[PDB]
Write a protein that binds this ligand. Sequence first.
Ligand SMILES: NCc1ccc(C(F)(F)F)cc1
Ligand SMILES: NCc1ccc(C(F)(F)F)cc1
Length: 330
Amino acid sequence: STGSATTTPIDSLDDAYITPVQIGTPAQTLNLDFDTGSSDLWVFSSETTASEVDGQTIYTPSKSTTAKLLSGATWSISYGDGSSSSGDVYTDTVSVGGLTVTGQAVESAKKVSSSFTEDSTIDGLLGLAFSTLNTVSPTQQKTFFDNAKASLDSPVFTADLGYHAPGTYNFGFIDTTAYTGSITYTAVSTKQGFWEWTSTGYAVGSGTFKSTSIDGIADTGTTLLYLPATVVSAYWAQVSGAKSSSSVGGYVFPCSATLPSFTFGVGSARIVIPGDYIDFGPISTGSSSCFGGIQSSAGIGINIFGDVALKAAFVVFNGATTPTLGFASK
Ligand SMILES: NCc1ccc(C(F)(F)F)cc1
Ligand SMILES: NCc1ccc(C(F)(F)F)cc1
């Protein structure tokens, strides 16, 4: 079997991407943020603290004939940006673009942090990292991808994120019409539960390619590109007026500047991020200082190939027994 669903940016900056997901019987359609950096499927629900819901669509397990409370199970998660949420667990039928999984753990949020409440367009998250990161206690639960793996034609899913445009998540097959050239596959380490790979280097604009190993994670749930300080300083040194701002919390640049592209290495292949992808607009309404899409990972502890990098490529998440990551130009 296979599945295919359209993913849509939530705003004009591509801050996140939402994908419609059917939960329950009859179907309750929620727009979820597909997050390859986490492994919990959690949703706003009828159980969420009422003051913490502001425009989201909520899952109502009491109206689903297939919903079963997972007795005694709780969950609590904290994301690298300080966001958090917690609640209890149900099992229910979950379908993505025609691909159906019965008995999927659907984690009902009782408490959500402020950043989720203020994001009215995101009804929840669908984690696509490895199941070892799932926070359900005392019985860890599998991800949607892990539960569907056996019935998929091929144990893969692909991410084709659009630049200011809709994109596609595909489960079970590689669309050979969606990319140009060949797919370059690179080895993945699962030791931390992430889609963790090693980039072979980088280049700034038309500059010389620097062969150097950059260890990082493919994370659709992270907006920006987070790279080591040496690399990020080398990029922003090529933008006139660019500087690191402690008050803003990152590199900013004059909104009138033109940004160079950024190239990162996948094996012997190259993925080029257009400079326009690195522009995230004014730091405040009316400001002439603009926020950069490439930031330092020094404070994070891990390099993150977020949406800024991934939307420049066709990306294959190969969940075979030896998992691999595939990158193609598009
Ligand atoms: N997109 C989920 C996510 C968020 C943060 C991190 C961090 F900060 F731990 F790297 C990993 C994954
Ligand atoms: N990396 C996972 C993640 C995704 C979105 C959000 C937001 F935007 F809702 F705050 C937080 C954390």
